[PDB]
Amino acid sequence: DVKGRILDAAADAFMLRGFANTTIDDIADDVGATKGLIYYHFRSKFDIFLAVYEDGMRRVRERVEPYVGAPGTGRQRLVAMSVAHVENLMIDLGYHHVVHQGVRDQASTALKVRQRDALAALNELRRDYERMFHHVITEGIADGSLRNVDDALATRTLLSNLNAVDVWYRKIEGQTEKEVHDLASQVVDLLIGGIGAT
Amino acid sequence: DVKGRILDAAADAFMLRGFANTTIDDIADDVGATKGLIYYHFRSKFDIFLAVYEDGMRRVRERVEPYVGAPGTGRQRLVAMSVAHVENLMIDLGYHHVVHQGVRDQASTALKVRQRDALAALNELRRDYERMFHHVITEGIADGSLRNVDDALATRTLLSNLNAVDVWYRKIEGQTEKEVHDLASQVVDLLIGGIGAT
């Protein structure tokens, strides 16, 4: 509900000014409320970080998991999973940064165990997500619709390639859903299809 | 000669701790020297970061540029350039981090003309490095060794994929130069040839 509004503006502020130099007041300014309502909804600043991670990891999974069991060859579901994964990134950049800057928070010596208890639990959520891609890649290797490559290395490589889109992608003012979807499909075409000729 | 020892130490400390959480103190401990030694060869912590960036650009360009004019189709030279880039990434991991940590020292206080001038200067070195790959990609497309894709999108996609090896790759001690070369060849096979079959 109205936490969703806080999670977005928190993720975006987390992405722009950094977790370290963003404060609960800064989210209060962005969300247009007082320091009260934020602290009503999450325990602490690190709780919003955890919540954006958790929510953003749920967003990408509800969008990608439906294709794991769908019909089609392995390559065909992998393509659909990837376009979804890239499209999630370009639409929800703030969530994507907090998810993959959960190490930027790890850069400071891991302080609270009862927090590194939830952050590690969250890491397992990202682990499970990547397992979906490993499963389809394995299936696509066996059904011939992918190359006989190393299943582990191809999974690491592909997922890092999908998350690397944020290196050069910017939110263009006025890009439509269709345009973003099409650009994600262009990107996935180079990732799955390669750039060399055959 | 000996400055290189401080550059090695700052690159790795900037990688693990992060730029902000490393001080001139730790670099001195890490080289086995006093703070005064570092303040000899560099005015400021940022100027070290500047020197690590500059040495990171020189190392990778020296390793990769020879393959630009080597014999081969555009694909063959793109492959050779890319392996050397990834080899340099795996071998000089701290330097690579700093060369692309730059995004984190751009969002921070862009403050001094004497320094921000030099930081933007390094980004043109980087931009000019990334133009070497763009030019080879354009040739590879024109000579049929690469699929007829968007040469600008493929350049951004490829370079970000090559630089994303650092998501999952860790220096494993005892790993030889040959093993790094083999692993980098494996990665580049996937970036150039895709995972898709047929």
Numbering used by the authors:
A (entry chain C), B (entry chain A): 10 to 207
Article excerpt on this structure:
The structure revealed no density for c-di-AMP in the inducer binding pocket, but density for a di-adenine nucleotide was observed near the four-helix bundle module of DarR, with the nucleotide making contacts to both subunits of the dimer. The density for the adenine moieties was well resolved while the density for the phosphate groups was less clear. Hence, a di-adenine nucleotide was fitted to the map. Each of the exposed adenine bases inserts into the binding pocket of an adjacent DarR dimer, leading to DarR polymer contacts in the crystal. As noted, the density for the phosphates are weak and indeed, there are no phosphate contacts from DarR.
Structures of TFR proteins reveal that they share a two-domain architecture with an N-terminal DNA-binding domain and a C-terminal inducer binding/dimerization domain. The DarR N-terminal domain consists of helices 1-3 and the dimer domain is comprised of helices α4-α9.
